[PDB]
Write a protein that binds this ligand. Structure first.
Ligand SMILES: [Zn+2]
Length: 47
């Protein structure tokens, strides 16, 4: 019910899985080394 979209650090592919605190398995490479791909876009001017 709680699905979060996560992005991978090693195979760089995203998987929409449930939010699992004990480990969200990337189905692409069997790795738990993942970030969240639901990163919110904020508008800020930076030079
Ligand atoms: Zn992966």
């Amino acid at each position: 019910n709680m699905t979060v979209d996560i992005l991978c650090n090693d195979c760089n592919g995203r998987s929409t899985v449930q939010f699992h605190i004990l480990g969200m398995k990337c189905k692409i490479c069997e790795s738990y080394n993942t970030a969240q791909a639901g990163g919110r876009r904020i508008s800020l001017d930076q030079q």
